[PDB]
Amino acid sequence: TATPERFSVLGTTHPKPKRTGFGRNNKMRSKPSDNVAWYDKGPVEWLPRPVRLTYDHLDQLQQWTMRATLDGRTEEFNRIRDLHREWSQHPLMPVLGDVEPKFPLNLFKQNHRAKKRFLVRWHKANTPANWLWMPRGPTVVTPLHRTNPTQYPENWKQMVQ
Amino acid sequence: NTFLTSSVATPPISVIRTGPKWWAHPERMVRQKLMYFTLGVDQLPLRRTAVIQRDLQRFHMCKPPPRVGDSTGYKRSRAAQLNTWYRRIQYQEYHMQHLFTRHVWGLLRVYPGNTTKIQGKADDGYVGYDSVPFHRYNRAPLPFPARELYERRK
């Protein structure tokens, strides 16, 4: 009906101000939370995302390793085995008195948010890089795995006579 | 792969303390063992976890042993030491799983979920088709196509 350009009361309605915060009650901030992962510490970002492995992934991996074996490409196998050798050493037994810290308990008001926060922060700090309990480096001796690719069965031509 | 939603990471203690529900579930354990076997490396950490966990679930129902009470605290210290050692072994197994899964996905050209790292060709972390217009960890915008970690031809 030829909408007039002059709205009398429609404009004068005290427009709602923009939301300030987020989350619960629109008051959460944008602080970097504990969910942030560290992509520098180790090949896997700490607090790893929940990756789930499927049987179709297993079948694809079987096909890939079949193709690699049939084509003679063994660099991937060697790098995988070296990575496993480096990361899969037996953890040394902790000495007496080694215990992960526990959060103090109070009965009047247990703050579950702080209870989970302490655990998350502690485990975030406990990166695989500084896992002194797990032996690592070249100084360790591993009498369970082949040390070099030369002695692996794919290099069987060398060991003769 | 099929899970492309941004995910929340639970502490390794929270993962381990779960009994034969997800962490110690036989289906997931045998899937991990199959993956390790197909890769050709030994399953020593997985077996060390399984031997502990089967006994733990076997003895979960019974009562704790009666104790006179050690004056020196040696028994309590030894129990804590054993618990910590088992927890660290399971930590090593958890890290091994979460490392080799990423390595296998990188080899198989499988695009992982949001905000995760694959040591091959994606070190910053993969973000694609997320509800937020930015990486949410670098606060940097991303192109409309998610990303191309791998080539086109197979």
Partner: peptide, 7 residues
């Protein structure tokens, strides 16, 4: 005691 290792 579930698992005990010599080394």
């Amino acid at each position: 005691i579930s698992y005990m290792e010599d080394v």
